[model samples]
Target: GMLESTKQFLKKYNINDRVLKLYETAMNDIQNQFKILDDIREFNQLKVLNAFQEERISEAHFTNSSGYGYGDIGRDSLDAVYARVFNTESALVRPHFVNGTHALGAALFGNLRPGNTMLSVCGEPYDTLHDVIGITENSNMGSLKEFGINYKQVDLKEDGKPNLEEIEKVLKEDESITLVHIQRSTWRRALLIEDIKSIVDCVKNIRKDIICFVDNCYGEFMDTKEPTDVGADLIAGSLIKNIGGGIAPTGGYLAGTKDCIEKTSYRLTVPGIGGECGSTFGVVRSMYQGLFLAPHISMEALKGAILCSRIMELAGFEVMPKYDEKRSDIIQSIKFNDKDKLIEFCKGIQTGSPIDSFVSCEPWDDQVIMAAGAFIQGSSIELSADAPIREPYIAYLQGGLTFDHAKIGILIALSRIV
Candidate 1:
């Protein structure tokens, strides 16, 4: 009953045989996740609707044609909308933010002065944030290390859990530690939101004055309860990833208490103007639509993650945060035994993408070799996967905009190699 073109598309990749069988294999799981996504979508929709009703997002919130950006009603309402969604007292959602790392850098620099030291209670942060936290040396990177600010991290223990002893030792020994930074996503086991509450509770017991900031990049909206709900003093993320709803061309968000948000806004914009002045530039509509769409897309992405783990695990490849685990985020990592298989996997995903279907991906010579030439610069929400050319060569498959596309990509990706 499908269109003739649909049949031809299936033939193009030979998707109807084993690939389709894999789809058949994951159907029950996918259907279950579909039901889950519907509930999440409605819940997120209510949040946006309530924000509109309360913040009074009306004709007054439209952006003025003038490029000048003082007292932009739409921009202000957008921040309020994010604040309500994240369960925070205040928020800053702007197109000005470069990425998640940049938003995180703003939060850190805004909250910390030159002499104030920071501690990483959640071990090393995402790789891109290493230089920002002053853990890695990057010449002229202008990271925390470049400034007079100091940084310290407590690595995970032998059992691969948070080293509370080490974290407490650093906090006690270093009285200058003004902020305790927590990363919500890493390659390890999915740290449940419950675990975040436990970590925050542990730190508050030690030092109530110290700020507890959560790097909530890919962790937002996936669960009903956010890090802010669990007592994160501040939280940050890239709109281009989860909360952007795949249509927001570029932006990021930071939500926290009034003081922390205002301080961060100063760094995001400037000292005197702060969050009060910023051009919406017809961006609010897309952002509002994106936020409304984010929850649905994010849940679909999580389903894709589980599907990936199931398929790969069946193939004798190991997967992180297993197919049937309680997920804290929508990321699935599969370890391939060979490097060429890793590169081939990325190429397969790139080929399956609706955009840039005629491109080849090779290993980059960075500290980590990646193959993510996405349509929207770095939009991982649109089904992208990559691997570092190292031991085990783990391919990190991020979320997709739709389950069908992820199914196609997973089938095509595995078909090429296995």
Candidate 2:
């Protein structure tokens, strides 16, 4: 259970505390501008209408593909919603866009052709993409490496954070690099908004023509600002990750300049249809609601991060609770070098899952695969929270669909740790 001191600290920031008070004020202001919840319901109702209309339109405007009607309408709706929420120049949100990796693939392949080097200004990328870029042993022939792209990773600091000096050197040395990719995926470290601003400034100084893309999957809604709010050229993310608010089944989005959006669409669809062919009849509704609720949800994420970090530190495990000047989102990891403790921690969280309550001690079954196995659905055992690294650590992730639930989840996890 929570120690008296920890409980007091939590109470200070509870529902009616200063932090939540400020958050509520901001939420009210946002709600006043647009009846967010009501608008969401209206949007859902309109989606039903749009689906029926798509069938009619498909028959009327039959070129080669009738599916283009649904795709275009959904794309247009998503673009409008994205502009309202993020204030971007253009956006492409598609239910059929797969995951963040696929979205990043679309952005990279669309922008950079063969013979152009793609430089990862920061160090090693997230796990799945490592193979695509040839960082790992598994090499797929048609992957990014096969497309004649040269990959270079800058080393992070001993503290497991980005090394700015190394990043600058790589950018200065490589004139052949046409693309630069950065990911804000560090669980323990924080990625400040200022860092994004610095990256943008550096890109402008280095080469305005260089395509700067951010894999902003897990970083959304964590702060009051965004990379684009600063000066990123392009940003892509998974709707199912942060933007979907855990409601969306699966989808991804890419938002950027007009040229980039158009090119990405082409790459996704093929030349004639312009790459905007997918059924988003249901997802468009969720995206609308998710964007409206994102700010409040993000505040909850921050609180969870703070709570997780402090509690894990108390547990005597080395943790990366606040590695960055300011965190971009809520993701905390408790580094227990003992493998057994890591497994126990994971099992502890799994036992607390809201869904089927069960303890997971053995390696997850391949056929009976489950994400996270923790309280929250879709929590990644390998990425955000914790995975069995060489050092053997457990990453404890906590975020709620509602602020109250988020707070409770953090408290429960911390209590168990104590």
TM-score of each: 0.93, 0.75
lDDT of 2: 0.59
| Cα RMSD to the true fold for all candidates | 2.4, 8.5
The CA lDDT at 80 in model 2 is 54
Could you give me the TM-score of model 2 versus the true structure? 0.75
Question: Deviation in angstroms for 287 in model 2?
Answer: 1.9
- Candidate 1: list runs displaced more than 4 Å: 1-8, 29-41, 138-141, 158-160, 366-375
Cα lDDT tens digits, model 2, 263-297, are 88887788667645665554455565555455555
- Cα deviation of 330 in candidate 1 (Å)? 1.4
Weakest ten-residue segment in model 1 by summed lDDT:
366-375
